[PDB]
Ligand binder design. Structure first.
Ligand SMILES: Cc1ccc(O)nn1
Ligand SMILES: Cc1ccc(O)nn1
Ligand SMILES: Cc1ccc(O)nn1
Lengths: 283, 283, 283
C-alpha cells in the first residue's frame, strides 16, 4: 500500500509540474453537483488521477477523477474534480496524499464545499453555513484520518484544531454575500462528521441536536485535518439540503435525488460567490 | 476476501436451491438462548454454513452455524442458526452476504430477536421492547456495515433508514401480545448499538440515558441496515436482561450467566409469540 | 500477524524469565515525561522489546521501547518503558500481548499514569485525577481492544467493567497524598477516551462536558480493558495539562510543548507518590 509520505507525494508533484507550468497557491474541492466552476478555469490542464504516480486507485467506485490546474480571476488554482470519500473504503493514506501534493505544489489556502443536513432549527433547505468548528465522531472513535505513523516533514504528531477554520476567510465570504444582497441565506455553525453512507437516522438527528451540532455530513473533516496538520488555511461551506429535525417530527425523508435537486437550485450562485472569494483572497 | 456482490450471493443461492425445494418469503435471526423455534421448523433442511459456497468462515469462533429452511404455520421460512456478530472480527462483507442471499431466495420480511440492557427507567428484566429506531455509534464513527463500494444491484449508495422498522409489523406484534394478555411486558424504544464485546460501562450507561436511548446491545443494527438497503421489511424485538442505570446507582453488575438465565425464563413465550407473528403476516 | 494468544504470550514470558530471575507481582505503565521512576528501579534488567519473541514491532514510530524488571521499596515490579498507543496504528493484538505477558509473569496489580485535558470546571493545570470510570468512544464504535476472537485462557467473551478501577487502590493513593499534604491537588473523575492523535476540538470539548466527562485523553482505556479481562487490578491517574473548556471560551490552545512542560513540573512529586503506593500495596 502507498503511504502518504514525503517521497511519494514528491514523485506525484514532479509529474504534475512537468505536465503543467501552473504554480498554484489556492486549492479547491467541490461538493456533489457543485463543480461547475472547475469547467470554467482558464488556460487549464486536466490530469486524470489514474495518470499521476502514487495517486489512489478509484476505478472500483468509478465516475470522474481528475486534477485540474489553471487561472480564476487572475489567481493560480488547483482543483480536485471527483472527491474521495471515506465511506467508499479509501484508507487514511489514500485521502491524505492528494492534499499533501497540493502542499508541495504551493497551496496556502483550501476552499471546500459540501452538501449537508440541517440540525439547528433556524436552517432551511437552500441555506449556506460557514463552518466554524466540528464534532468528529470517527476521530473520537479511533478512525481519525491521522491514525498511523506521523509524517514529520508535513506536521506535528499531535495537532491543535482550534484555528482549523480561518476566521478572516469566514469574514470575507460573508462580506461578499452582503455586497450581493444574499446574506439572509448565510449562517455559521458546527459540523458533525457522520462516517456514512446511510443518512443519519431520525433518532441520531435528535441526538445531534442535544450535542450542539448545527449541520451533519459525510465529508470535509478528513481533508480539513490533513490541511491543518501541514499549515494550509481552510474555508468550508455547507449547502443545506433539508432540516433533519423537522423531517423526524413530521415522519418524512431525505434522499439523494432531493439532495441533488437542491444542489442544482444553488449551483450558479455558489459558483459566482466562490469566483469572487478567489479573486479577493489577500495577497 | 469474498465480497458480498451479486455474483457471489447468486452462487450461494444456487447451491441452497439445489439442496432444498423451499422458496421462503420470511427470514428469521434469533438471539442467544432464543433459538428453540428453529428446532421446530417443519419438513426442514439443515445446511451447515461451511458447506455453502461463499459463506463466511466461522471456525475460529466455533459453535453452531447452519442455515435452516422449512415451514412454520403454513409459511415458508429460512433461519440463521448461529448469528454472526461484528465484535468477533467479521468484516462488512461477511455480515452482509447471508442477508443478500436471503434476498435472492425471495425473502420479503426479516424477523429479529436480541438480548439487550435496559436504559429507560420503565424497563425491567424480562420485558420485551419493539425497536422503533436506533443510534448507530459504529456508523457515525466510520464503521457502518455499508462502508466500501456500493453493490448497486441490491440498493442505493445513500440509504434512508427512517422507515427501517416497519410500523405495521410493530402493530401486529402488539396485537398478538394483547390477545394473549402479556401486553404489560411489551414496550417500544430506541436501540443503541454498542460495538462490544464489553458490556457498556456504568458511565456509558449514564451517557446513553442523556442521549435518548432506551436499550443497548451488540447486534441487530448491521443486519437491519443491509435488509433496508435491499428493500426487506424488518421487525426487531429486544429481551431486556437488566436495567443498567439501576445497576450503576446500586453498584451491581450484569454478566453473561445472568443474561442467559433471563433468556431461559422467556424463551417459550417468545417462541409462541413469533410462531403466531409468522402465521399472521399479511399476504 | 501475531495474535495475543496463550502460546505466543508464553514464548515471550519464557525468554523474559531466562534473562531475569525477577518474579514480579506489580506492573507499571508511565505517561509521557513521567518515566523517571523506571530509571531508579533497583537490581534491574533492561530488555529491548525488539529482543523479545512475539513483542510488537515498534521501529516505524521509533523512540524507546524496553521492558524493565527489578525492585522498588522491596517489591518486585515490571515496567513498560515506551508505551504503545492506538493512534500510532498498532492493532488490538499488538496492544494486548505485553499486558498478557505481564499476567503470565505473575502481575496482580497494574499502576498507570497519563497526561489528559480537563473538562470538569474544578480542574486546573497540574492537578491529579484518580480515574473512577470511563467513556470509551472507540469501544462503542466497533474499535474496542477486544474486537476479534476471544482468547478463553485469559478471560470471558463479554467482560463487565463496573469494577475495572479498584476502589481500595484509589483510597490508598488518596491517603498517601493526605500524609504528604498535597491532597488539595487530588480529584476523582470519569475519563473519556479520544482515539487521537488530534487534540479534541473546542466543540468536542463542549460536547464532553454535556456527556458527564471529567477528563479526556488518548491512552489508558485499552490497557485497562485487557487487564480487567484477565483479572488484574488497576489504579489509573491522569495529570491535567489544561482546562479545554476554559480554552474554548477564551480562544486559546493546548500543544505538546505545553503538555510536556506540565509533566516536568509534576514529575518528581508523581515519582515520590508512586514509589510509596508500590511500597504500601497490601500483601
Ligand atoms: C444531506 C445529508 C448529507 C449527509 C448526512 O449525514 N445527512 N444529511
Ligand atoms: C445485556 C446487554 C447486552 C449488550 C450490551 O451492550 N449491554 N447489555
Ligand atoms: C492534554 C490532552 C491529551 C489528550 C487529549 O485528547 N486532550 N488533551
Amino acid at each position: 500500500p502507498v503511504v502518504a509520505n514525503y517521497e511519494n507525494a514528491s514523485m506525484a508533484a514532479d509529474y504534475i509540474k512537468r505536465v503543467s507550468n501552473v504554480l498554484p497557491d489556492i486549492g479547491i474541492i467541490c461538493g456533489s453537483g457543485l463543480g461547475k466552476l472547475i469547467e470554467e478555469i482558464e488556460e487549464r490542464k486536466v490530469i486524470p488521477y489514474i495518470n499521476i504516480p502514487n495517486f489512489p486507485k478509484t476505478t472500483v467506485a468509478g465516475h470522474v477523477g481528475n486534477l485540474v490546474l489553471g487561472s480564476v480571476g487572475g489567481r493560480k488554482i488547483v482543483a480536485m474534480q471527483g472527491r474521495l470519500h471515506m465511506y467508499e473504503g479509501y484508507s487514511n493514506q489514500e485521502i491524505a496524499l492528494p492534499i499533501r501534493v497540493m502542499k508541495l505544489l504551493g497551496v496556502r489556502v483550501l476552499l471546500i464545499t459540501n452538501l449537508a443536513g440541517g440540525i439547528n432549527r433556524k436552517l432551511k433547505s437552500g441555506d449556506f453555513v460557514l463552518i466554524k468548528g466540528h464534532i468528529n465522531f470517527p476521530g473520537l472513535g479511533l478512525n481519525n484520518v491521522l491514525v498511523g505513523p506521523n509524517q514529520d516533514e508535513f506536521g506535528p504528531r499531535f495537532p491543535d484544531l482550534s484555528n482549523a477554520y480561518d476566521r478572516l476567510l469566514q469574514q470575507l465570504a460573508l462580506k461578499i454575500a452582503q455586497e450581493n444582497d444574499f446574506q439572509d441565506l448565510v449562517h455559521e455553525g458546527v459540523y458533525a462528521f457522520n462516517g456514512g453512507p446511510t443518512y443519519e437516522s431520525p433518532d441520531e438527528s435528535n441526538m445531534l441536536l442535544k450535542l450542539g451540532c448545527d449541520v451533519v455530513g459525510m465529508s470535509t473533516v478528513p481533508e480539513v485535518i490533513i490541511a491543518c496538520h501541514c499549515g494550509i488555511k481552510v474555508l468550508a461551506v455547507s449547502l443545506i439540503a433539508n432540516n433533519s429535525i423537522l423531517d423526524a417530527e413530521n415522519d418524512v425523508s431525505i434522499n439523494h435525488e432531493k439532495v441533488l435537486a437542491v444542489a442544482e437550485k444553488r449551483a450558479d450562485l455558489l459558483q459566482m460567490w466562490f469566483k469572487e472569494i478567489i479573486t479577493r483572497l489577500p495577497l
